[PDB]
C-alpha cells in the first residue's frame, strides 16, 4: 500500500534515530559500578576490620622501624639533619609482615619465590581476595576478557642463576593474568602519587569501548630499602613526629610506608543483568597537567580549578550537587593553602546558603601511602555511603590561619556528621595531585536501592555442606582454618558449595558433611588434619580428570528389600513422578499398582510372588537413574545384566516405557508356571 | 492528500539519522593523521 509502506519507513526511521541517540549517550557517558574491594594496610587486613573500626577514632603511626628486614639500625638515625648519610625522624608506620608468601599454592619454585619483589606477592594475594569477595568463582574467570590497569613503582632492589633477577623486579608485572588466565589488556602505569587515579581513568575508557568486560584497578608499594627516609631527610622536607597534619598548624609532608589496594569495576547494566552486587557508581573523571609553573615540583591553583570544572562538565552535573570532598592532604606549608583556596574558588560562591561542603583527608589518619594513596581515598568514601556516617578523623583542631577559613560554606570536618539516606541522592568527589605535575579529579555517586529478598528454609530438608574447598594447600593443615572458619553464632544454610565464589573448584583435596541440626564441623572433620572421622566422607582426590566418564550398572535379582523407601517418594518430586508414570503405563494390563506396594499400604500383596517382585524392582531402578541424571550425572555405557538388561535398554533409549513394562509382566507371568 | 506530509517527515527523519550515524563514526572510528617524526639511531643517523 502506498499509504502504509511510507508509515512503516517513518516508524523505522524514528526507532533508529532513538536507538542511535541512546547509543551516542551510552558511548559518551556510562555509569560504572564498583563490585568488590580488597586492601592490605599496615596493621590489619581489609574492609571493616581495618576501617570503619579504626576510622572511628584513629591512631596509627606505630613507628618501630622494621627489624625483619636488614635495615642496619643505629646508623640511619642521627639528631643532626645535616649529617651526610643519616636521617632523623625514626617514626612512621609499617606493614606487620612483608616477607610472607605461600608459593606452593600459586605454583612457583621456592628459588624463584625468594628472588621476587614483595609487591608481586602481595598483589597476587590481594587480587585473589578481591575476586573471592565478589560472589564470582575465581576459576570461572579463565578465558574471559578482563584486564588489569594497575600502577606500580620500583622501590629498591636486591643488591646481592639461569633466570629471574631480571624478570621479578621488572615493574611490568602482568603475571596476574598469567596465573588466573585472563585475556584483557595488562597495563602498569607510573605517574607519581596520582598514578592509581589516572590508571582508573584508563580502565573506564576501555569499559566504555567494549574491549573489556571487567577491570581491576589498584596500586601497591613495599618500601624495601631505607631509601626515601634518608633522601628526603637531606632535603629538609620530611619533619619529625611524622603524624601528618592536614589544614592545621604543622608542616611535615611525611612519606608514610607501604600499602596495597585493589578494586573491581564493571559496567552497571552488565552488573544488573548478571546479578552481582553494586556498592557505588563512578560517572566521570578528568586529568590535566600543571603546565609551566614556578618550579618543577610546585602546585598550581588554576590547573586545579580547570580540572575540577572539566570533571563537573563531563559528569553533566552542577557544583552544588556535591556534599563531601576528599582532599589530597599531604600536610605541608604550601600545598594546603593552595588546595583550600582552589576549593573555595570553585565549589564556593554561594554553595547553598546553609549546607557547608564537608572536607576531609584520609592521609591525616593513615599516612601518605605513596602511589596507592588516591585509590585509598575511594576506600573511605564508599564506606561512608554504606554506613550513613562521615568518618571525620582529621586529627587537628586549630585550622590554618593563612587561608580565609571563615566567610565561606566549606566547613572542616572537626567531629562527625550523620550521612543518612533519603532525598537528595548522596555524591562525593576525590582528587589527586602528583609530583610530576599531573592532576586528577573523580566524582562518585550512591548506588540505586534494590533490596527486597525473601525468607525460606528452617524445615528439615537435609542440606549438603561440601567443605569450603579443601585445596592444593599442603594437602593438610589448611583444613584447620576451614574447620574453624565455619563458626555460626546465629545463621542457617549458608550454601558454600553453591555457585558462591568460595567454590575454588575444591582444587584437589575436597571433603563433605551432610546434616541439618548443627555445625558438627569442629568434630572429626576438624581433627581430620591430624586424625579420623565417624560418619563423614573424606577424599584425597587428585582431579586426574575433572570430568569423568560415567557408566551405570543394572543387575538386581536379590535386592528384595522390605519396601524401597517411602520418604524419598514423598520428598523428591522427580522420583514420585517417574513412579507414577510407570504405574500409569503398567495399569492397563495388570491390576497391581507399584506405588501401593511400595508404600506398604493395607491390601498390598506380599513380596513373595515373582509377578510382583520382578516388576516393582524395575519400576524402582529406572527411577533411581532419573534421579542421578537429574543431578548432572549422564551415563555413557550402561552394562547391567540379568533382568536389568531391559532396564538398561530403557535408560539407553532403545525401548519405550510401556513396552518394557508389558515385557516384564509377561515374562514374569510365563516364568511363574515353573516353580520348585 | 497526506502523502506530502509523510514524505517530508520521512526526509527530515532520514536527515537526522544520517547526522547521528556521522556522529557515531566520528566518535568511534575517526582516522588519525601523522604530521612529522624525529629519531636518534645507532651510528650517525639523526635525520
Amino acid at each position, epitope marked *: 500500500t502506498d499509504s502504509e509502506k511510507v*508509515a512503516e519507513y517513518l*516508524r523505522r526511521a*524514528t526507532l533508529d*534515530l532513538r536507538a542511535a541517540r541512546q547509543r551516542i549517550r551510552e558511548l559518551e557517558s556510562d555509569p560504572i559500578a564498583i563490585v568488590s574491594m580488597a586492601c592490605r594496610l599496615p596493621g590489619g587486613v581489609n574492609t571493616p576490620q581495618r576501617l570503619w573500626e579504626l576510622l572511628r577514632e584513629g591512631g596509627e603511626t606505630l613507628s618501630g622501624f622494621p627489624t625483619d628486614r636488614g635495615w642496619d639500625l643505629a646508623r640511619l638515625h642521627h639528631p643532626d639533619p645535616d649529617n651526610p648519610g643519616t636521617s632523623y625522624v625514626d617514626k612512621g608506620g609499617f606493614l606487620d609482615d612483608a616477607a610472607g608468601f605461600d608459593a606452593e599454592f600459586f605454583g612457583v619454585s621456592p628459588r624463584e619465590a625468594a628472588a621476587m619483589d614483595p609487591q608481586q606477592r602481595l598483589l597476587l594475594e590481594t587480587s585473589w581476595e578481591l575476586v573471592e569477595n565478589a560472589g564470582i568463582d575465581p576459576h570461572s574467570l579463565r578465558g574471559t576478557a578482563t584486564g588489569v590497569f594497575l600502577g606500580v613503582a620500583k622501590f629498591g632492589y636486591g643488591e646481592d642463576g639461569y633466570s629471574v633477577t631480571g624478570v621479578a623486579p621488572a615493574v611490568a608485572s602482568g603475571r596476574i593474568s598469567y596465573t588466573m588466565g585472563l585475556e584483557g589488556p595488562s597495563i602498569s602505569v607510573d605517574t607519581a602519587c596520582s598514578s592509581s587515579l589516572v590508571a582508573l581513568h584508563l580502565a573506564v575508557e576501555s569499559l566504555r569501548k567494549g574491549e573489556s568486560s571487567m577491570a581491576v584497578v589498584g596500586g601497591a608499594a613495599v618500601m624495601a630499602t631505607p631509601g626515601v627516609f634518608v633522601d628526603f631527610s637531606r632535603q629538609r622536607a620530611l619533619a619529625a613526629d611524622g603524624r601528618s597534619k592536614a589544614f592545621g598548624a604543622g608542616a611535615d609532608g611525611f612519606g608514610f610506608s607501604e600499602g596495597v589496594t585493589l578494586v573491581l569495576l564493571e559496567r552497571l547494566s552488565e552488573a544488573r543483568r548478571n546479578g552481582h552486587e553494586v556498592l557505588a557508581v563512578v560517572r566521570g573523571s578528568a586529568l590535566n597537567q600543571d603546565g609551566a609553573s614556578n618550579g618543577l615540583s610546585a602546585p598550581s591553583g588554576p590547573a586545579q580549578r580547570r580540572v575540577i570544572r572539566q570533571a563537573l562538565e563531563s559528569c553533566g552535573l*552542577e557544583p552544588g550537587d556535591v556534599d563531601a570532598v576528599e582532599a589530597h592532604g599531604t600536610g605541608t606549608a604550601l600545598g594546603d593553602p593552595i588546595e583550600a583556596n582552589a576549593l573555595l574558588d570553585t565549589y564556593g560562591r554561594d554553595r547553598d546558603a546553609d549546607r557547608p561542603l564537608w572536607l576531609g583527608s584520609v592521609k591525616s589518619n593513615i599516612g601518605h601511602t605513596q602511589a596507592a594513596a588516591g585509590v585509598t581515598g575511594l576506600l573511605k568514601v564508599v564506606l561512608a555511603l554504606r554506613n550513613g556516617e562521615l568518618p571525620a578523623t582529621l586529627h587537628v583542631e586549630e585550622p590554618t590561619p593563612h587561608v580565609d577559613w571563615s566567610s565561606g560554606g566549606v566547613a572542616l570536618l572537626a567531629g562527625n556528621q550523620p550521612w543518612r539516606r533519603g532525598e537528595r541522592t548522596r555524591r562525593a568527589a576525590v582528587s589527586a595531585f602528583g609530583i610530576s605535575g599531573t592532576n586528577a579529579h573523580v566524582i562518585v555517586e550512591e548506588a540505586p536501592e534494590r533490596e527486597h529478598r525473601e525468607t525460606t528454609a528452617h524445615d528439615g530438608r537435609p542440606v549438603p555442606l561440601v567443605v569450603s574447598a579443601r585445596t592444593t594447600a599442603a594437602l593438610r593443615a589448611q583444613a584447620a582454618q576451614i574447620a574453624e572458619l565455619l563458626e555460626r553464632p546465629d545463621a542457617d544454610l549458608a550454601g558454600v558449595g553453591l555457585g558462591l565464589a568460595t567454590t575454588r573448584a575444591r582444587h584437589e583435596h575436597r571433603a563433605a558433611v551432610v546434616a541439618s541440626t548443627r555445625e558438627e564441623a569442629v568434630r572429626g572433620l576438624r581433627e581430620i588434619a591430624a586424625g579420623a572421622a565417624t560418619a563423614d566422607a573424606v577424599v584425597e582426590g587428585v582431579t586426574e580428570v575433572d570430568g569423568r566418564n560415567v557408566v551405570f550398572l543394572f543387575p538386581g535379582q536379590g535386592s528384595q528389600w522390605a519396601g524401597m523407601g517411602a520418604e524419598l517418594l514423598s520428598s523428591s518430586p522427580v522420583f514420585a513422578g517417574k513412579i507414577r508414570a510407570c504405574d500409569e503405563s503398567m495399569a492397563p494390563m495388570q491390576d497391581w499398582k507399584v506405588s501401593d506396594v511400595l508404600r506398604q499400604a493395607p491390601g498390598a500383596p506380599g513380596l513373595d510372588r515373582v509377578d510382583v517382585v520382578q516388576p516393582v524392582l524395575f519400576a524402582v531402578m529406572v527411577s533411581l537413574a532419573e534421579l542421578w541424571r537429574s543431578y548432572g550425572v549422564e551415563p555413557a555405557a550402561v552394562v547391567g545384566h540379568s533382568q536389568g538388561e531391559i532396564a538398561a535398554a530403557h535408560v539407553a533409549g532403545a525401548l519405550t516405557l510401556e513396552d518394557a513394562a508389558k515385557l516384564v509382566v509377561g515374562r514374569s507371568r510365563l516364568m511363574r508356571s515353573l516353580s520348585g | 492528500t497526506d502523502s*506530502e*506530509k509523510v*514524505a*517530508e*517527515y520521512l*526526509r*527530515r*527523519a532520514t*536527515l*537526522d539519522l544520517r*547526522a547521528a550515524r556521522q556522529r557515531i563514526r566520528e566518535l568511534e572510528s575517526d582516522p588519525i593523521a601523522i604530521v612529522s617524526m624525529a629519531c636518534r639511531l645507532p651510528g650517525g643517523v639523526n635525520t
Partner: antibody, heavy 118, light 114 residues
Framework: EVQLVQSGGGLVQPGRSLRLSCTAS????????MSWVRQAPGKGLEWVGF??????????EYAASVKGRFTISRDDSKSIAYLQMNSLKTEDTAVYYC?????????WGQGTLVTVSS | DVVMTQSPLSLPVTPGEPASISCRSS???????????LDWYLQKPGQSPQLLIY???NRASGVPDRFSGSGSGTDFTLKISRVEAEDVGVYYC??????????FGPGTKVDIKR
C-alpha cells in the same frame, strides 16, 4: 547551510510591482515546497501566500485575502522562487522571507523589509 | 473541526531553574497509529524563527538537548532542564491535522524574572 539568499526590497510607491526572490543551494529544489511568511512591524507574522507549491503537483494554492493581488507567480526551474508583487498597497509594509518546506517550516533565512508609503 | 491552541502566555525565568510550558488543544491530534501532529517553534529577537521539535518528542538536530517534549491526546508540555540567558524569543505551538492554518496568534513569551 546557506540556501537562503533572499534579496529585494524598496519604496515601491503604491501601484507598482517588485522583484522579491530567494536563492537556494545544497539541497534539491525538485522535492521541496517554498512557503512565504511576512512579519508586520510590531505585529504577528502570517503566511504570504499559503504557497504549498513545486514538487510533483506543481500547484499554486494562493492564500485568502489575496485573490491574485499578491501575484503568486513563483517561477521554479531557475534555482529561484521569485514572487511578483504588482498592485501593492500601503497596508502591506512588512519583512518577507521564504522557507524550506510545505508544512515543516524547518529552515528559514534572512528576510527583506518592504515599505510602501511616503 | 478546527482546533484551538493556548499557552500560559507568561513565564519569567531565571538562570539555572528549569522551566515548563503547557499547551492544550480542542480535539485529539492522534492519527491511525498516534504520533500527534504537534510542532514547536521558537523565534529569537532579531532573527527568523526556527523549528525546535516535531511530532511530539523528536527534537531536531542542532537544537540543544536541554529541551524535551511530552504529551498526547489534547495536551502537551515542553520542558527545559536548565534555562540560560541566550533564549528569550517567543514560542508557538502548531498543529498539523489541517492546512488552512493561519498565524499562531499570541503564542507565549519568555522574559527574565526580577
Amino acid at each position: 547551510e546557506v540556501q537562503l539568499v533572499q534579496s529585494g526590497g524598496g519604496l515601491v510607491q503604491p501601484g507598482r510591482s517588485l522583484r522579491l526572490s530567494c536563492t537556494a543551494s545544497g539541497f534539491t529544489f525538485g522535492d521541496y515546497a517554498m512557503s512565504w511568511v511576512r512579519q508586520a512591524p510590531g505585529k504577528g507574522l502570517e503566511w504570504v501566500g499559503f504557497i504549498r507549491s513545486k514538487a510533483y503537483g506543481g500547484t499554486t494554492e494562493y492564500a485568502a485575502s489575496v485573490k491574485g493581488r499578491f501575484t503568486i507567480s513563483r517561477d521554479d526551474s531557475k534555482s529561484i522562487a521569485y514572487l511578483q508583487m504588482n498592485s501593492l498597497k500601503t497596508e502591506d509594509t512588512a519583512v518577507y522571507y521564504c522557507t524550506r518546506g510545505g508544512t515543516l517550516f524547518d529552515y528559514w533565512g534572512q528576510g527583506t523589509l518592504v515599505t510602501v508609503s511616503s | 473541526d478546527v482546533v484551538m491552541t493556548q499557552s500560559p502566555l507568561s513565564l519569567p525565568v531565571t538562570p539555572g531553574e528549569p522551566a515548563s510550558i503547557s499547551c492544550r488543544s480542542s480535539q485529539s491530534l492522534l492519527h491511525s497509529n498516534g504520533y500527534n501532529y504537534l510542532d514547536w517553534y521558537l523565534q529569537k529577537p532579531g532573527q527568523s524563527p526556527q523549528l525546535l521539535i516535531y511530532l511530539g518528542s523528536n527534537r531536531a538536530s542542532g537544537v540543544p538537548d536541554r529541551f524535551s517534549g511530552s504529551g498526547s491526546g489534547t495536551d502537551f508540555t515542553l520542558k527545559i532542564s536548565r534555562v540560560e540567558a541566550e533564549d528569550v524569543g517567543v514560542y508557538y505551538c502548531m498543529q498539523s491535522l489541517q492546512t488552512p492554518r493561519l498565524t499562531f496568534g499570541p503564542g507565549t513569551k519568555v522574559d527574565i524574572k526580577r
